[PDB]
Design a protein around this nucleic acid. Structure first.
Ligand SMILES: Nc1ncnc2c1ncn2[C@@H]1O[C@H](COP(=O)(O)OP(=O)(O)O)[C@@H](O)[C@H]1O
Ligand SMILES: Nc1ncnc2c1ncn2[C@@H]1O[C@H](COP(=O)(O)OP(=O)(O)O)[C@@H](O)[C@H]1O
Ligand SMILES: [Mg+2]
Ligand SMILES: [Mg+2]
Lengths: 614, 614
DNA sequence: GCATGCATGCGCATGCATGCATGCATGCTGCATGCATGCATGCGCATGCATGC
DNA sequence: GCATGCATGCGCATGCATGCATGCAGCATGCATGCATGCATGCGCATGCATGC
């Protein structure tokens, strides 16, 4: 029967939902969607814990401290408003600043039980999504009547109830036999996941701590193993810890699950674009020095190397791939290789690409070997089946892979990369498993000269020492050297000393600067690094240029000319060069946001290739 | 959760209540009463089982056969209509013809369990009305909050439920002590009664059969021990008949309780007066021979005895009694005595008064003795207290007592009747009991002459032989004799032979006429016996005449004249004669329906007294 | 007016429906034993590759 | 070209999380007796009345 306290807690949350009206229209929107569009959306909204502090302090403190008394009231209050604006229950989500309830699996203790918490870590394993039976319907052929029953369990209501163990009906109240109507019963899905502390926040050489999260219905398939995640929910004690006859059974009943992005991880980074942002992105295009402004802002601290600055942007945007009715796939990724002297900032260039790209994985020479790049087979304890867990290149699909110290790899891995750089498929034929996986990735790499330093007397085949088959699979092979000089020594020295003296905004000189780990959230003046990602993200999703009848003649001339010319080149010439020219041409048209490839872009591609060749 | 069958059964009873709209306005009336009048009325109505047969046959058959499935639906349907017309639950009652479900406690067997039945019999014992606790409210001084709980049992719902044995709360959910708020809790009353087969329908010399009826709330104090009753309800089996370890526990859960009237019983007879009836009753008055027409219709089959015919009507209407501020009570009942020869139809006159009067008890000489007339003391097994059960004259309050063979009584009962005929109180002083009871009754009696036949040679003191104290307590002493003759022999013979040849309407001559037991229900041409009761009932309730300054002189003259006159009279003269004249005068004014006594009535009273005296 | 037998209350004795604790034994049930089963582990050996000479 | 040493997969024993039945015992519930209690029975005895003579 009605409780006064429940009623007042509902009333105050009705007033809260009335004062800040940004949540009512959000509820309106989902009904508008599910009616006008008949992908049915789930019945949920998100609340800010910062708004609650301003509106009411005690109600805020109560959800932080006593969720099991203030959450069902708020949910019922929300359901009432939903049924009000209406011409299936509803549930809430939580965001804002939590404070002392922003914990990790190691610092989460028994004094935080029965409160709402935020937990950080890595997802290590997910289970199979299973149906759960709620209501079952039956039929009696001797009376022409249908009967039903309801089932419930302890992980669906935040407060403790008196158990009702009902049974599965096979028989009528007179004895008539009942047929089970599987299509008329209701089933709701279930999944369980385990979380662990992230490897770069955990103490070195110490065993890790983990926590179990239970998800149901709509939150059931949001993540995969090996992800950075933030979860919010109630830390619940269950059952009796052996007092009917280790301790109590503890787990989190999830309500919010946020994917997070980190360096060298399989979760991509995306940002929400404001119309103001779009206006600047589109304004920048018309000025006909877009390429130079964007190129010089690519790690401006390294000096020169402007053509590699161009090439990295061309790889970051990339062309277009094409599928024919036949069933043929034609590649559209660009790959870069760099050979130079042992103090030419190769690793700074690689690390910058790792920091800026939306999805990137870092590998160093012999570091990754064999299965570590392609895939490996494991066994599942429960079902007993043999499964696959992804290697580096399977994870970096529609992305970039950074290979530092490229020349240190064995031939066995080289033959495996031959298949990824051209067909972009990985084929596995192990005991019982025969499957093909997708790996559509671009590759950037850096290599050391065989003789320590580049020898101008000898020809390239004696300095590089890589097979022609692998060389042809790289679109661009750049060579760089540091010529000892005085003019450039002065110029470089002065600039490098400029850089080494820089105050971050807001410190008195002397004060040490402070380091923090950057965890993201997923959904001629130089341009800011945070804006370059916004530019690229729009430039890939929106523009898909088509080929014109003009520039084909330029490409044809350049390819024919190169193949019937007799200068010693830094790479062999094949049909791969023919396709490379088109990929390069379409990348520049992605830079310009035009719907068609053009002649100026074709000549920029040709100029770049010829500089990198001769 | 909702049942389809329950829903359809509710819907059809909504249609039934809609087609016959005589039950909706009855519900309207009770709300009108309880709002306008703020004696709150109970929430109940009465349905006809004859209407149900015409509207739907299967629904009728279902209530007769399956009450436990069609009664809760009908009650809910009624509650919905009540809450509809509204600008606490409601319940039903049943009347009409039942058929094979009109049984007695002897013919009620185990094949009628779980069906609605009608039972006839006599109420033999009633229990004490006790409160029953439903909802209890509490207070916590450490939190300023009030808590409640609900209780239920098996005798409140017609269908079987799963028991919930809740406990009495003394403690809060934290441990705070609670005060019990007796004024805020809800209590509903309870009573149990036993029924037995009536003595004039039961087989002679055989032990009787009985049945238990449970009544609750509003039906809790409708009857008293020693009443003819008709009860309708469900015949229920309760508990487990020893199968957890005689047979099952059987009882009736009452819904309807009707009092019935029978000859020589304490339940009065009343009829509902139609406006058409009132018009005839009031029309008859204006004609100035009302007394003669009503008098000659009093058992017309007995011949002559017209002055006794008048006297019986005067007793049947009676005067008015008066209470003073002082605390004095002045009598208003009339009493009659008759002395005559052994073939003068005395007992026919007595039996006619027994059959016609609204409440009458028959006693014959030595038949009733001692406690049988006044009262007796018994003991109650449960509470152990000494109680009183009423004798004949305590039961016949505001009524008549017929004593045939008056001269056969002993002096001990005569002294007890001295107190009833004058002060109309009975005083009991037994061990522990000292109480005074009300007995306001009129008395008619008949006595035998001492010498077999009335001897004209001797004076009345030698023929009657009753004490002057008792004679003065009788208003009228009539004497009658049969004078052997020829003219009156012919006249009486012919009339008596007329009577002995009479065909009831609708029989071929020869066919025996059929006897039936007449059980009533409670709430110059000759006038019908059924109408005389209607006349008397209105004449007593409505008219209460007052005394005028005119007729007092007539009464004064007659009383003075009689007390200073020297003829041998048939009774002594006292102030009892003075009061008798006023009682007689006011009775005739009750016959005329005038608001004041008059002179013509006074002279009729004087004439009647002087005929009965001389 | 006197003598008599009946019916009315006293004054014994006994049985009888209610009601509740105690010692013995019933009847179930939670606990300790034994065991089948299938997945993972910790291991030594044979092959194919990379690094000199 | 040739000789050598390391990483990878094959082959072999062993331990160990799940899971379920059975004999034995510990353990609480229902039953049989035993009695206390207060009411009602029914049974002879004394008194006050109604009848006969
Ligand atoms: N052209 C350059 N401009 C600025 N700094 C440079 C340049 N070349 C090298 N450096 C600096 O010198 C160091 C080069 O180290 P590293 O990145 O290991 O070189 P490499 O990868 O070529 O062996 C870094 O401090 C880098 O910042
Ligand atoms: N005056 C009368 N008129 C009609 N019938 C009479 C009359 N007197 C007597 N009777 C009849 O004679 C019989 C009298 O019997 P009963 O009532 O016992 O007489 P009583 O009571 O006077 O001794 C009945 O059949 C009655 O109907
Ligand atoms: Mg380096
Ligand atoms: Mg008689």
């Amino acid at each position: 029967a009605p409780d006064a306290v429940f009623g007042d807690r509902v009333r105050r949350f009705q007033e809260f939902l009335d004062t800040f009206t940004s949540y009512r229209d959000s509820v309106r929107s989902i009904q508008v969607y599910n009616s006008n569009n008949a992908n049915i959306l789930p019945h949920r909204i998100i609340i800010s814990l910062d708004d609650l502090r301003e509106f009411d302090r005690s109600f805020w403190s109560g959800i932080l401290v006593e969720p099991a008394y203030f959450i069902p009231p708020a949910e019922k209050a929300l359901t009432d408003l939903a049924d009000s604006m209406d011409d299936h229950p509803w549930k809430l989500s939580f965001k804002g600043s939590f404070g002392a309830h922003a914990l990790s699996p190691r610092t989460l203790t028994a004094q935080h039980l029965n409160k709402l918490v935020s937990v950080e870590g890595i997802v290590t394993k997910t289970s199979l999504v299973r149906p759960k039976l709620i209501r079952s319907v039956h039929y009696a052929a001797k009376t022409g009547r249908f009967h039903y029953r309801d089932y419930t369990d302890a992980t669906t209501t935040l407060t403790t109830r008196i158990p009702t163990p009902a049974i599965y009906p096979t028989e009528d109240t007179e004895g008539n036999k009942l047929t089970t109507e599987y299509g008329y019963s209701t089933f709701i899905d279930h999944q369980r996941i385990t979380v662990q502390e992230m490897p770069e926040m955990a103490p070195a050489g110490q065993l890790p701590r983990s926590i179990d999260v239970i998800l149901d219905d709509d939150l059931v398939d949001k993540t995969k193993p090996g992800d950075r995640v933030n979860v919010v929910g109630v830390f619940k004690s269950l059952g009796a810890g052996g007092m009917n006859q280790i301790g109590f059974k503890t787990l989190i009943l999830g309500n919010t699950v946020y994917p997070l992005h980190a360096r060298s991880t399989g979760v991509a980074a995306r940002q929400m674009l404001t119309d103001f942002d779009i206006r600047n992105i589109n304004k920048l295009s018309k000025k006909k020095d877009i390429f130079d402004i964007l190129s010089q802002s690519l790690a401006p601290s390294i000096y020169g190397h402007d053509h590699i600055k161009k090439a990295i942007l061309l790889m970051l945007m990339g062309g277009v791939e094409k599928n024919l009715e036949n069933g043929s796939h034609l590649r559209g990724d660009i790959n870069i290789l760099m050979v130079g002297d042992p103090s030419t900032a190769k690793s700074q260039l690689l690390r910058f690409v790792l920091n800026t790209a939306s999805l990137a994985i870092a590998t160093t020479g012999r570091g990754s070997s064999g299965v570590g790049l392609t895939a490996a087979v494991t066994t599942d304890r429960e079902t007993g089946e043999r499964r696959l867990e992804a290697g580096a290149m399977v994870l970096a699909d529609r992305g970039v892979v950074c290979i530092d110290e490229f020349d240190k790899m064995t031939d066995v891995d080289r033959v495996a990369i031959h298949e990824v750089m051209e067909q972009q498929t990985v084929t596995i034929a192990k005991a019982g498993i025969h499957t093909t996986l997708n790996a559509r990735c671009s590759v950037i790499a850096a290599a050391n000269p065989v003789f320590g330093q580049y020898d101008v007397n000898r020809d390239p085949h004696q300095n590089i020492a890589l097979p022609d088959s692998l060389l042809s699979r790289f679109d661009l092979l750049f060579v760089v050297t540091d010529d000892i000089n005085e003019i450039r020594d002065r110029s470089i020295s002065e600039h490098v000393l400029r850089t080494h003296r820089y105050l971050p905004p807001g410190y008195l000189e002397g004060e040490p600067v402070r380091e923090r780990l950057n965890l993201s959230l997923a959904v001629p003046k130089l341009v800011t690094i945070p804006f370059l990602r916004k530019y690229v993200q729009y430039a890939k999703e929106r523009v898909i240029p088509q080929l014109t009848q003009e520039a084909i003649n330029v490409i044809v001339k350049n390819y024919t000319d190169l193949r019937n010319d007799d200068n010693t080149k830094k790479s062999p010439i094949t049909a791969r060069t023919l396709e490379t020219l088109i990929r390069l041409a379409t990348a520049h048209a992605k830079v310009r946001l035009s719907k068609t490839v053009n002649k100026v872009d074709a000549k920029v591609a040709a100029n770049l290739l010829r500089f990198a060749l001769l």
